[PDB]
Design a protein around this nucleic acid. Structure first.
Length: 64
DNA sequence: TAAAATGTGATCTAGATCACATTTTAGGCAAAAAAGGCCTTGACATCCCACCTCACGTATGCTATAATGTGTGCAGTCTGACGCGGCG
């Protein structure tokens, strides 16, 4: 529920031209996910990669 | 009338005469040969060119304890008029 902070704030942002406030306020939305979300991001990544390795394994001339 | 000009005439004195042989020497006409003008040759000297050429310099890659929302040193507020967007 951080996009709705951006919502009303931008509704009431005092004509703030500086992109620093913009970007820094935008990263405030996403939080710090840790300790296995790291490991789970890794798991999903290596899974999809090993399945593009299925995708090479399925192609015959890959060995050629 | 002072002072310069004018006759004595015999005894001389440096150059001209005068026909012909021999030099010379032009001057100017033909030219031999030498020294520029033309080219060549050998020998040198210095390269331009470029063709390479290794050392030093340079473009790029990872480093696994862990660490996770700026600010930050400034401005000193000039001011009167005119547009324009809210602001009722």
């Amino acid at each position: 529920a951080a996009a709705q902070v951006l919502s009303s704030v931008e509704s009431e942002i005092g004509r703030t031209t500086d992109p620093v406030r913009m970007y820094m306020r935008e990263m405030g939305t996403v939080e710090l996910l840790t300790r296995e979300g790291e490991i789970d991001i890794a798991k999903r990544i290596e899974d999809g990669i090993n399945q593009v390795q299925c995708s090479v394994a399925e192609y015959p001339e890959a060995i050629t």
